[PDB]
């Protein structure tokens, strides 16, 4: 499901080597190390990201995300 | 059209360049502060040029004002130099499209690029020195030139005159740093690595600055303008983008990041880093 | 074959760790991780890319892409 | 604990393959290799980073950090 | 030997996971995955690169390259 | 010790997978693959780098480096 869509408000590197972003007021984390530079890049260049997951509660995990340039 | 760069004093030098700028370019709405601006070259037809007379290098000489430099208008590239005492126009090979009525045109073997000129001159722009004295010898070298094959001494002269004419026209920083050599103290101007790097990013700066709208700063590759006054103090004239030198790749001139305007290609060039995780072998 | 040439309209990181881009109105995915940051940087700046593959149908995979300056 | 917060004053790759950044007048190192390019991009763009560690002594190590834009 | 000197006209990720650049009208490929982001960054910023290799015929391999601002 | 401070004049990827930079008129090389993206990014953005090594003569190696924007 499309959990959240918007700019990245903050990103965070977590001590367990996971990575979190806040999109549309709700936080989501991911385990995939390849997404860390992709997400920080989106945050810095103003890309609209669409977090996609089967579990969309704030604080939940994800591993699918679309990137649009604005 | 015809213009003159008068090297008599610092003030005649600055006024000469400003008169050329006023005629061939238009200030940017969002980067000007009185009579000091970043100006965009007005579009002229291909092959359009200006003939810039050189004068005032030795005021004890009523006949040292017979060197001219031909400068393509859309790009401020020096197409060649004219000896008015012998009515001979020595023209670089990449400018066959520039023709002058009533002057004996000589088509030369080599081109106008700094790579070609530095090689023949055995002199790198970075660290190169220019004084009133060495500009006089540069004038002598070009007026004593003959043939169709550039020499070491003529190439050194061109490199010096390009910096204090065309590059100074583009960059107020080069104008300001060099004009100190026109003092009675007669100091020596050294073209710094920073000065050279500015000329290597002229097209890149020209593509970014038209998008400026009061941001705290501007970042273009290795160039940093940390406030708007740093822009005006460095840049005077830019190309008209929308010229091939305006674009490297892509089609997004800038990315605004935290009230700093970035050349998008610069950001892309340090954002394409994979997870360092993957720096691995054979596992 | 040259399957599609143009700007990257959007990109998408997939849950199976593949990576999707839309070029010239068609979608293609790749399993080469090294391409992920390279393709995103092309997207941010408007670089036109050329997708190449034996399979050019929308939805097909790819592993060869040219980065052009036009 | 939020140990320090601000723009990155300088960064430094260390002989022991760790990476240190100076924030709010205090230095902090991390052995997390994926943070090296992320922290450099943050330093380059003037991101406001928040260093989070169980040990906030200047010169102490960390492995959690938040990245914010202006 | 200095095979070619100039800016990158295009780059290309190849199906065998090598990376090709065309410099001064000739094509050269390399096997070092580390050079892929480095070579694209040079293309993006218009760096003058110098391909160095025992074999300077167009279509040949390389693994040494200088990145100049000139 | 602090061997050289300034902007990177050029960099070179060497056949042996090491990486060379020229700073303040002298050359230095490093074996750490992780400095390759960091060093090149510093070059193309014009950071002022500070090379640090027990060995400070040109042509010598290093594995400690500070990055400043200014």
UniProtKB/TrEMBL annotation, chains A, C, D, E, F:
It comes from the Bacteria. One of its GO terms (cellular component) is extracellular region. GO terms for molecular function: toxin activity. The B subunit is responsible for the binding of the holotoxin to specific receptors on the target cell surface, such as globotriaosylceramide (Gb3) in human intestinal microvilli. This is Shiga toxin 2B subunit. The chain holds residues 20 to 89 of 89 of the full protein. Coiled coil: none annotated. Transmembrane segments: none annotated. Disulfide bonds join 3-56.
From TrEMBL, chain B:
It catalyses: Endohydrolysis of the N-glycosidic bond at one specific adenosine on the 28S rRNA. The keyword DNA-binding does not apply. It comes from Escherichia coli. It is an enzyme of class 3 (hydrolase). Gene3D superfamilies: Ricin (A subunit), domain 1, Ricin (A Subunit), domain 2. This is rRNA N-glycosylase. InterPro entries: Ribosome-inact_prot_sf (IPR036041), Ribosome_inactivat_prot (IPR001574), Ribosome_inactivat_prot_CS (IPR017988), Ribosome_inactivat_prot_sub1 (IPR016138), Ribosome_inactivat_prot_sub2 (IPR016139), Shiga-like_toxin_subunit_A (IPR016331). GO terms for molecular function: metal ion binding; rRNA N-glycosylase activity; toxin activity. Its EC number is 3.2.2.22. Disulfide bonds join 241-246. Zn(2+) binds at residues 63, 66.
């Amino acid at each position: 499901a499309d959990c959240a869509k918007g700019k990245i408000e903050f990103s965070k590197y977590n001590e367990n080597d996971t990575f979190t972003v806040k999109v549309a007021g709700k936080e989501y984390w991911t385990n995939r190390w390849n997404l860390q530079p992709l997400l920080q890049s989106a945050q810095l260049t103003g890309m609209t990201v669409t977090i996609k997951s089967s579990t969309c509660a704030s604080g939940s995990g994800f591993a699918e995300v679309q990137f649009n340039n604005d | 059209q015809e213009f003159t760069i008068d090297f008599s004093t610092q003030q005649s030098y600055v006024s000469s360049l400003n008169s050329i700028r006023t005629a061939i370019s238009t200030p940017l709405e969002h980067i000007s502060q009185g009579a000091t601006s970043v100006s965009v070259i007005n579009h002229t037809p291909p092959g359009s040029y200006i003939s810039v007379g050189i004068r005032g290098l030795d005021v004890y000489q009523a006949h040292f004002d017979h060197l001219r430099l031909i400068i393509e208008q859309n790009n401020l590239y020096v197409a060649g130099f004219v000896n008015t005492a012998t009515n001979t126009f020595y023209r670089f090979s990449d400018f066959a499209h520039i023709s002058l009525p009533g002057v004996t045109t000589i088509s030369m073997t080599t081109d106008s690029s700094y790579t070609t000129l530095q090689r023949v001159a055995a002199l790198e722009r970075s660290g190169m020195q220019i004084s009133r004295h060495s500009l006089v010898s540069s004038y002598l070298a070009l007026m004593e030139f003959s043939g169709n094959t550039m020499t070491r001494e003529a190439s050194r002269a061109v490199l010096r005159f390009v910096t204090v004419t065309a590059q100074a026209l583009r960059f107020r920083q080069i104008q300001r740093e060099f004009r100190q050599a026109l003092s009675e103290t007669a100091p020596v101007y050294t073209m710094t690595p920073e000065d050279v790097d500015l000329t290597l990013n002229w097209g890149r700066i020209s593509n970014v600055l038209p998008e400026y709208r009061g941001e705290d700063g501007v970042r273009v590759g290795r160039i940093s303008f940390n406030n708007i006054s740093a822009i005006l103090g460095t840049v005077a004239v830019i190309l008209n983008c929308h010229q091939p030198e305006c674009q490297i790749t892509g089609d997004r001139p800038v990315i605004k990041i935290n009230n700093t305007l970035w050349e998008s290609n610069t950001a892309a060039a340090f954002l394409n880093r994979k997870s360092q995780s993957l720096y691995t072998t054979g596992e």
